Design a protein around this ligand. Structure first.
Ligand SMILES: COc1cccc(CO[C@H]2[C@@H](O)[C@@H](CO)O[C@@H](O[C@H]3[C@H](O)[C@@H](NC(C)=O)[C@H](NC(C)=O)O[C@@H]3CO)[C@@H]2O)c1
Length: 138
């Protein structure tokens, strides 16, 4: 097992056909999970399941530039469950990050940060036990 928050370096940045796979289990009474693809201090893609935002479960995605959050993209389809094991796969495509959870397509996030090769770290945080975090080229 891995210590959370965990930093996964992405050597040379991301590129299309790179597949990141994260395996873990949601804690009991979880509040939030976050994946943060970073370009230095900037967050190119923040993927943030929220377990109780005004008694709703929602995934919020966004980008942070110069310490400012941008326009949120919100998904009400919510495949995570407190206490249960999950798999998140993020496939870098030419125009977007493509996210699947437990083998089912979830969402796509169009590239706002376009210098893909400068997105050099992935932070994994929140209310999880982290089992593995890896990448491969498909
Ligand atoms: C909770 O713990 C941590 C730890 C590290 C980093 C964060 C960053 O969390 C922020 C991030 O998820 C951004 C993504 O857009 O949202 C921030 O929250 C927003 C919130 O989503 C907005 N809610 C709505 C309903 O629009 C709110 N909007 C208004 C008008 O207030 O704005 C906040 C602040 O940007 C979240 O803090 C978290």
């Amino acid at each position: 097992p891995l210590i959370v928050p965990y930093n996964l370096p992405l050597p040379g940045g991301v590129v299309p056909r790179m597949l990141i796979t994260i395996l873990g289990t949601v804690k009991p009474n979880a509040n939030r999970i976050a994946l943060d693809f970073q370009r230095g201090n900037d967050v190119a893609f923040h993927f943030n399941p929220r377990f109780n935002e005004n008694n709703r479960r929602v995934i919020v995605c966004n980008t942070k530039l110069d310490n400012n959050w941008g326009r949120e993209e919100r998904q009400s389809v919510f495949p995570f469950e407190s206490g249960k094991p999950f798999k998140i796969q993020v496939l870098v495509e030419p125009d977007h990050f493509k996210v699947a959870v437990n083998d089912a397509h979830l969402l796509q996030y169009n590239h706002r940060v376009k210098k893909l090769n400068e997105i050099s770290k992935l932070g994994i945080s929140g209310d999880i036990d982290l089992t593995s975090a890896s990448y491969t080229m498909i």
